[PDB]
Design an enzyme around this catalytic site. Structure first.
Site: not given
Ligand SMILES: C[C@H]1O[C@H](O[C@H]2[C@H](O)[C@@H](O)[C@@H](O[C@H]3[C@H](O)[C@@H](O)[C@H](O)O[C@@H]3CO)O[C@@H]2CO)[C@H](O)[C@@H](O)[C@@H]1N[C@H]1C=C(CO)[C@@H](O[C@H]2O[C@H](CO)[C@@H](O[C@H]3O[C@H](C)[C@@H](N[C@H]4C=C(CO)[C@@H](O)[C@H](O)[C@H]4O)[C@H](O)[C@H]3O)[C@H](O)[C@H]2O)[C@H](O)[C@H]1O
Ligand SMILES: C[C@H]1O[C@H](O[C@H]2[C@H](O)[C@@H](O)[C@@H](O[C@H]3[C@H](O)[C@@H](O)[C@H](O)O[C@@H]3CO)O[C@@H]2CO)[C@H](O)[C@@H](O)[C@@H]1N[C@H]1C=C(CO)[C@@H](O)[C@H](O)[C@H]1O
Ligand SMILES: C[C@H]1O[C@H](O[C@H]2[C@H](O)[C@@H](O)[C@@H](O[C@H]3[C@H](O)[C@@H](O)[C@H](O)O[C@@H]3CO)O[C@@H]2CO)[C@H](O)[C@@H](O)[C@@H]1N[C@H]1C=C(CO)[C@@H](O)[C@H](O)[C@H]1O
Ligand SMILES: OC[C@H]1O[C@H](O)[C@H](O)[C@@H](O)[C@@H]1O
Ligand SMILES: [Ca+2]
Ligand SMILES: [Cl-]
Length: 491
Positions: A100, A195, A233, A298, A201, A197
């Protein structure tokens, strides 16, 4: 993107948070393979900012400098070595993809980075990629600060800087391609998935565009046409315009409602009790089980309040055991390090602390004689109660939730088809009762208190009679107030 790509009969991932590649490679061979773990979520393998104030925080790894595979966990050679040795013993690697953003906008220019790459945040200059001013969202963001100010505005949540982290222009084919290049590098090495992240966003359409560019998984280890497992996520507890369901097109999504509600129940807060878990899963308003990536804690939320963690070991083990026994979702087990907590007006001022280290050099995971870990690594995945519940989940895979019991308070039990049964006492008096287990007649080792070794048990024994019934006694003062038995713990 929905299939984990684990070996058949392996049903969990473990997050080996901040572990070095060499330690993970060894862990795969000596422990994770023989204990039936499906895979490992690794910390971001790409170059990040070396942050010296405060001293080498865990969160420096969430500020990328390039896509060079060069970190405190190790270099590209070590990373390749780990993925190969892990795949060769049937244990998968899932990468924490930080795509991101690049680093904090106020970070100083220079080579203070884990591979010595130059970068200049102020001028939006990341020449090891390369990215330049055109590759960020400065012009797209409409907030006064340039940062995210209000989560009730879905557009700024996507187009603006998350806590000042430079926001990549994921609408541009060039930016999408550089990210895909990095992810394809990892795929070809042998990584089984990602995963993603900070998925909230990013526009779901931009994530899709990046995923459209990805290779199939490496055909030496994976069947032809295999796609990376994607779990995104997204923290969605309700009340926001962005929803977990908005990401279902790209893969699975983290169900953060899961650990938040289970922690509240096991702590017996807010009037919650274990008997209410009878309709656990979609009955609690959770996303569909086939899209949920579930977990008690987490790496972020184990540093905040209400969530159960290794710091609350007794209740933590029960929560993790409940999760591993229950069919809802795909399960991820946390594996942590200890840090020198210090509370000032109810906040841990040391929640930034990085992994055990000697002057910034990550400490090896040493293994004690009793199979626990030294050097301040917690190794929850090696706690007998958790490790054995990871196998319980494998053994009962595909079996229906059945034979539910509750006392109307906090004494509950349930089975998984004819392959496993689990019993919890979270009330302030003794649980003594004969229950239908759904299991074949036999003597079963309780895998919470002990192990089956050759033809005996090192802990509690449960005796299942011909009608499938067995007596359980659990004191409320039990160190582990729960028992679990399954088809492979039978003598
Ligand atoms: C960490 C997490 O944050 C975001 O989650 C939101 C969530 O989307 C919201 O819904 C909400 O949720 C709450 C809810 O409201 C509560 O009611 C409920 O009970 O609890 C939840 C929380 O569980 O709030 C949360 C928290 O804001 C993201 O949506 C999520 O993706 C995030 N998790 C991710 C993402 C990242 C980013 O890669 C990782 O973040 C970590 O790493 C960063 C980067 O190093 C670290 O931040 C540090 O660096 C910053 C640059 C610095 N910033 C300051 C500097 C400025 C000058 O430029 C200022 O502009 C700025 O405002 C300053 O704060 C930070 O101070 C410094 O700490 C993060 O702290 C760290 O968490 C995560 O690890 C990853 O898992
Ligand atoms: C759908 C709902 O799921 C969860 O609610 C839990 C309660 O937290 C738990 O206490 C328990 O509630 C009662 C139970 O249903 C009943 O059988 C028993 O006799 O009494 C209990 C209360 O004393 O079990 C339920 C689930 O059955 C979540 O905690 C809730 O947040 C969640 N609610 C949802 C649903 C709606 C739609 O109305 C919204 O209000 C909310 O945004 C959403 O989160
Ligand atoms: C492998 C080992 O696993 C379990 O141990 C856990 C605890 O259950 C857990 O609560 C936590 O204990 C910490 C505790 O909360 C705190 O008081 C103290 O300050 O720190 C403790 C850790 O030092 O972590 C440990 C693991 O580190 C079981 O409870 C242990 O019985 C178990 N040991 C067993 C099992 C096996 C094989 O399954 C043998 O290898 C081993 O020799 C035997 O002792
Ligand atoms: O502005 C986008 C540009 O970033 C810089 C790069 O040299 C170039 O490849 C790319 O087109
Ligand atoms: Ca963004
Ligand atoms: Cl996560």
């Amino acid at each position: 993107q929905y299939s984990s790509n684990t070996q058949q009969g392996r049903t969990s991932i473990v997050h080996l948070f901040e572990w070095r590649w060499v330690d993970i490679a060894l862990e795969c061979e000596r422990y994770l393979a023989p204990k039936g773990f499906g895979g490992v979520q690794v910390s971001p393998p790409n170059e990040n900012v070396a942050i010296h104030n405060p001293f080498r925080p865990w969160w420096e790894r969430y500020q990328p400098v390039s896509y060079k595979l060069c970190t405190r966990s190790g270099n590209e050679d070590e990373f390749r070595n780990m993925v190969t040795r892990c795949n060769n013993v049937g244990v998968r690697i899932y990468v924490d993809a930080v795509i991101n953003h690049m680093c904090g906008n106020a970070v100083s220019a220079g080579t203070s980075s884990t591979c010595g790459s130059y970068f200049n945040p102020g001028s939006r200059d990341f020449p090891a990629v390369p990215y330049s001013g055109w590759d960020f969202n400065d012009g797209k963001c409409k907030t006064g600060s340039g940062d995210i100010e209000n989560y009730n505005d879905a557009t700024q949540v996507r187009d603006c800087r998350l806590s000042g982290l430079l926001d990549l222009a994921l609408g541009k084919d060039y930016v999408r391609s550089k990210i895909a290049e990095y992810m394809n590098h990892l795929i070809d090495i042998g990584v089984a998935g990602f995963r993603i992240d900070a998925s909230k966003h990013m526009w779901p359409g931009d994530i899709k565009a990046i995923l459209d560019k990805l290779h199939n998984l490496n055909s030496n280890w994976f069947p032809e046409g295999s796609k990376p497992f994607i779990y995104q996520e997204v923290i969605d507890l309700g009340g926001e315009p962005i929803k977990s369901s908005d990401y279902f097109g790209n893969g699975r999504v983290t169900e953060f409602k899961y650990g938040a509600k289970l922690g509240t129940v096991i702590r017996k807060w807010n009037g919650e009790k274990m008997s209410y878990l009878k309709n656990w899963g979609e009955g609690w308003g959770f996303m569909p089980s086939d899209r949920a990536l579930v977990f008690v804690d987490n790496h972020d939320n184990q540093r905040g309040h209400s969530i159960l963690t290794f710091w609350d070991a007794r209740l933590y083990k029960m929560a993790v055991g409940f999760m591993l026994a229950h069919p809802y979702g795909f399960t991820r087990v946390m594996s942590s390090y200890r840090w020198p907590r210090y509370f000032e007006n109810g906040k841990d001022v040391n929640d930034w602390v990085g992994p055990p280290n000697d002057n910034g050099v990550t400490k090896e995971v040493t293994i004690n004689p009793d199979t626990t870990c030294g050097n301040d690594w917690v190794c929850e995945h090696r706690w007998r109660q958790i490790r054995n519940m990871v196998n319980f989940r494998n053994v009962v895979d595909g079996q229906p939730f059945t034979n539910w019991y509750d006392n109307g308070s906090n004494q509950v039990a349930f089975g998984r088809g004819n392959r496993g049964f689990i019993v919890f006492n979270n009330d302030d008096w003794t649980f003594s009762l004969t229950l239908q287990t759904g299991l074949p007649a036999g003597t079963y080792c309780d895998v919470i208190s002990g192990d089956k070794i050759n033809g005996n048990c090192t802990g509690i024994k449960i005796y299942v009679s011909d009608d499938g019934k067995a007596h359980f006694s659990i004191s409320n003062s039990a160190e582990d107030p729960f028992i679990a038995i399954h088809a492979e713990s039978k003598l």
